[PDB]
């Protein structure tokens, strides 16, 4: 299992087949994206020798999951017959501060959420009663606690999980088809991101997500609650696969979210790249380019299908009164918010105080941006949605 002889996407495949002990796969869709990633980790000089191995190791594990899910479905065709109806899906720009709602929806026992451990070890699926106590989940929690090296180091802002097994993004299902925006944050250039947004056919990916969800439902049934910012970008393919999707559009100051995006990228850049070869001023234009797709893709879809197909969740409303937003979400989704559930939601908020709404200078200077430069990108967006800014 070494990345010395990994030159092509097929080599990555062999390793994944080696590790998982499986060799059959559902299609060829995974190859195009993985080939772009591999070509870059091999050729780009910005990568640390370690960084290269890290990216290839993650790709291998991701592809291995794809292999594991395919073997399972073949042995359990019936899972494909059970529908995934009216999934609750949160989309929009990244850095909108949606974390709270994901956890609150997870408090409803009739609703299912995608937990991070299910994006690491999906097969075999667990029962509802054990979604948070399954040994694979516990093991993940323990080796997470088993990396708390007090070696005078802070950490690495991403202990993905929170409490015992929490909601995660569909991004970690999607990257298994190598058509997910997360891979781009591990790449020095924007070739992969431009391919993804302007060329990649996203159908294979969303079709894969549905199968994935059908496998998790088979042992732990319920109505799905999903999230992933770039669902906004790929909203057309999403609708194709989940035509009945109840879309929750998450909003927040676009200027703030943009600078926050650029900042978010620093962590993966520092984990696998020689940061001195990077230009943070150039990261600003990429973030700007990416944000444009995050607002226009869904804006066009909304113009076509109607505002009523969406629920608008504002960051400022989520801070001042989340419980109010929940009741309105439930009314809108026309579903009863039981007292038991409302209590769990309140109990969660009590134990998880949220950062008060505050206004500070965004300052995209650090990334070569200005509100004046971003204004045209979000002009329509800010004009159609009443967003409370956190500027100056
Ligand atoms: C817009 C993000 C949608 C997916 C949400 C799960 C995490 C994906 C990556 C988060 C950063 C999104 C912005 C682009 C980052 C990149 O270029 O990789």
Three-state secondary structure along 287-353? Answer: HHHHHHHHHHHHHHHHHHHCHHHEEEEEHHHHHHCHHHHHHHHHHHCCCCCCHHHHHHHHHHHHCCC
Give dist(CA 39, CA 178) in Å, integer: 13
Q: Return d(Cα 27, Cα 18) in angstroms, integer.
A: 18
**Among the listed residues 177, 181, 213, 241, the one whose alpha carbon sits nearest the alpha carbon of residue 27:** 177
C-alpha–C-alpha distance, residues 126 and 128, integer Å? 7
- Among 179, 183, 225, 197, CA closest to 345: 225
Distance CA 142, CA 103 (A): 21
Question: Which CATH code fits 1-392?
Answer: 3.40.50.300
87 within 8 A of 226, measured Cβ to Cβ: yes
d(CA 38, CA 31): 10
φ and ψ at 306, to 5 degrees? 100, 145
Q: How far apart are CA 386 and CA 254, in angstroms?
A: 12
Q: Locate 87 and state its tokens.
A: 């999934």
Strands 111-113 and 88-92, sheet pairing: unpaired
Closest atom, ligand 1, to C-alpha of 265:
15
251 φ, ψ to 5°?
Answer: -115, 155
Any ligand 1 atom below 6 A from CB of 287:
no
**Which tokens go with 264?**
């978010």
Q: Are the CB atoms for 224 and 215 separated by under 8 Å? A: no
Task: Ligand 1 pocket test: pick from 171, 178, 181, 185 the residue with the most ligand atoms within 8 Å of its Cβ.
Answer: 181
* Sign, CA torsion 306/308/310/315: positive
Helix axes 203-217, 29-43, angle to 10 degrees: 110
Give me the sheet containing 111-113, strands edge to edge: 111-113, 223-227, 88-92, 246-251, 310-314
- Among protein residues, the one with the nearest Cα to ligand 1's atom 18 is 185
**b/e code 62-93 from CB counts within 10 Å (16+ = b):** bbbbbbbbbbbbeeeeebeeeebeebbbbbbb
Closest alpha carbon to 43 in 7, 80, 95, 4? 7
H or E element, residue 45: none
Ligand 1, from 230, 235, 258: best to mutate by most atoms within 8 Å of Cβ? 230
Q: Which residues of 173-210 are buried (b: 16+ CB within 10 A; e: fewer)?
A: bbbbbbbbbbbbbbbbebebbeebbeebebebbbbbbb
CA of 304 to the centre of ligand 1 (A): 25
Q: Is 22 in the pocket of ligand 1 (CB under 6 A)?
A: no
User: Of 131, 96, 94, which is closest to residue 111 (Cα–Cα)?
Assistant: 131
Token couple for 281: 């001023």
350 contacts: CB under 8 Å, gap ≥ 6 = none
CB atoms closer than 10 angstroms to residue 256: 22
How many C-alpha atoms does 67 have within 13 Å on its Cβ side?
19
Please say whether the beta carbons of 171 and 226 come within 8 A.
no
Query: What's the CA gap between 216 and 220, in Å, rounded?
Result: 6
Residue 304 CA, chain-centre distance (Å), reads 25
The answer to whether residues 244 and 85 touch, using CB atoms and an 8 Å cutoff, is yes
Integer Cα distance of 59 and 67 in angstroms: 12
DSSP assignment letter at 46: T
The experimental method, as deposited, was X-ray
Cβ-based neighbours of 36, under 8 Å, separated by 6 or more:
178, 191, 192, 195
228 lines ligand 1 (CB under 6 A): yes
Four-CA torsion 283, 288, 294, 297, nearest 10 degrees: -130
CA 81 from chain centre, in angstroms, equals 26
Euclidean distance between the first and the last CA atom of the chain, given in angstroms as a whole number: 51
Residue 108: half-sphere exposure toward Cβ, Cα within 13 Å: 23
- Centroid of ligand 1 to alpha carbon of 183 (angstroms): 8
- Counting ligand 1 atoms within 8 A of each CB, the residue from 92, 176, 229, 272 with the most, and so the one to mutate, is 229
Based on its alpha-carbon atoms, the radius of gyration of the chain, rounded to whole angstroms, reads: 21
Antiparallel, parallel or unpaired: β 310-314 and 111-113: unpaired
Give me the count of residues in the chain: 392
Torsional sign, CA 36, 42, 46, 48: positive
- CB-based contact 241:211 (threshold 8 Å): no
Between the CA of 229 and the centroid of ligand 1 the distance, in Å, is 7
């Amino acid at each position: 299992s070494d990345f010395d002889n990994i030159t092509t996407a097929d080599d990555v495949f062999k390793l994944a087949a080696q590790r998982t002990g499986l060799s059959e796969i559902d299609s060829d869709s995974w190859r195009e994206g993985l080939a772009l990633i591999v070509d870059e980790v091999n050729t780009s000089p910005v990568f640390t020798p370690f960084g290269r191995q890290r990216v290839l190791d993650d790709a291998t594990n991701a592809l291995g999951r794809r292999l594991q899910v395919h073997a399972y479905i073949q042995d359990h065709p019936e899972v494909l017959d059970a529908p995934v109806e009216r999934p609750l899906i949160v989309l929009g720009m990244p850095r909108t501060g949606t974390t709270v709602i994901s956890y609150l929806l997870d408090q409803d026992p009739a609703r299912r959420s995608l937990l991070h451990w299910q994006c690491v070890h999906p097969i075999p699926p667990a029962s509802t009663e054990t979604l948070r106590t399954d040994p694979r989940c516990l093991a993940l929690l323990d080796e997470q606690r088993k990396i708390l090296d007090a070696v005078t180091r802070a950490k690495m802002p991403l202990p993905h999980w929170e409490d015992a097994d929490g909601p995660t993004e569909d991004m970690f299902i999607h990257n298994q088809d190598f058509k997910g925006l997360s891979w781009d944050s591990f790449l020095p250039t924007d070739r992969y991101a431009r391919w993804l947004f302007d060329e990649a056919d996203m159908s294979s990916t969303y079709e894969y997500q549905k199968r994935y969800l059908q496998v998790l439902q088979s042992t732990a049934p319920g109505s799905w609650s999903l999230k992933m910012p770039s669902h906004s970008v790929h909203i057309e393919a999403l609708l194709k696969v989940f035509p009945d999707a109840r879309l929750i559009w998450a909003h927040r100051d676009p200027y703030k979210a943009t600078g926050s995006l650029c900042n978010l990228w620093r962590l993966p850049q520092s984990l696998v790249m020689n940061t001195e070869l990077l230009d943070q001023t150039e990261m600003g234009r990429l973030a700007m380019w990416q944000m444009r797709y995050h607002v226009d893709r869904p804006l066009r879809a909304r113009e076509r299908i109607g505002d009523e197909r969406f629920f608008h969740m504002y960051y400022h409303e989520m801070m001042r009164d989340p419980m109010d937003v929940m009741r309105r979400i439930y009314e809108w989704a026309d579903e009863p918010l039981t007292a038991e559930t409302e209590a769990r939601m309140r109990n969660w908020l009590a134990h998880h105080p949220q950062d008060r709404f505050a206004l500070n200078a965004y300052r995209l200077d650090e990334y070569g941006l200005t509100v004046e430069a971003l204004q045209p990108i979000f002009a329509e967006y800010l004009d159609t949605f009443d967003i409370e800014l956190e500027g100056r």
